[PDB]
Amino acid sequence: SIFWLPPAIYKSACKIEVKHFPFDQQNCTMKFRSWTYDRTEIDLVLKSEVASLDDFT
């Protein structure tokens, strides 16, 4: 088994649902996909349903 974790910085683009300014809820969606392989050689499955925040500040 291989267990690999590289750090990265991401700049996602998410639409701003600005109706109740200023207090409101922003819904930002970010996608992960393998640009090289489709579902013919690899298959992607999530380990845990929720993004872990053990290291969050």
Epitope: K19, S48, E49, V50, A51, S52, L53, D54, F56, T57
Partner: antibody, heavy 118, light 113 residues
Framework: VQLQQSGAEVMKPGASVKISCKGT????????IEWVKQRPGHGLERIGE????????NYNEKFRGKATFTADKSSKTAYMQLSSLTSEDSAVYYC????????????WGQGTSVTVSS | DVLMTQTPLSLPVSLGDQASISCRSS???????????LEWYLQKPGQSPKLLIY???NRFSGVPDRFSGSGSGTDFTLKISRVEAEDLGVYYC?????????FGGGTKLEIKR
Amino acid sequence: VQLQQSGAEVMKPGASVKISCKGTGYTFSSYWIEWVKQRPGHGLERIGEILPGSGSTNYNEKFRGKATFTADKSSKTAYMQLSSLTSEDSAVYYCARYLPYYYAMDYWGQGTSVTVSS
Amino acid sequence: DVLMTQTPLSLPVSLGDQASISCRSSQSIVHSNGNTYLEWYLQKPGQSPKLLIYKVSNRFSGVPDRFSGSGSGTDFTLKISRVEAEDLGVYYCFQGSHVPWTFGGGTKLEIKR
């Protein structure tokens, strides 16, 4: 997944009460944990939820200033400092996991009995 | 806070009869996304509450089909087809629209003879 709570707690009125919440089998520091107060007579009233990752806390407008939550990241444990206790708050306490706007409330605890008397 | 009104307070029904219970909110609890988020809880004497109906238009994974839920954008109704010896207990509503969240009033449900 599995939840653990503290044993029975008795104390003279006016002092503080600490109850512990342990969660295992999932990502403990990833989503909300909310507690519930059940008076032995009737009804269910909530007390509040916390996010064990950050310092995000909120309270119901009726139970403000009565309790203060706290969570640990090293050990998967949640505590609650309780303010001056009156004989109108002797009830059962539940804990549960919750994630807003999505799948939520799939498991519970076992129940913590707090019997305050002089 | 958006308060819940449960009707009736007690609906004694016989074994096998269909029972409907209404749960109304003081305000609109429909979210801007297009889904209404409400939870139904079933509590038995001396045990932790159980789950039967989350996301009313859907059903919980593990509960039999005898329970159903419906209603419009404001009025909600929980329906049971055949009440069994296990269905004794208390119902509870939980609205999931606005912050903070609150519970219902608690609907006592037993059998009748």
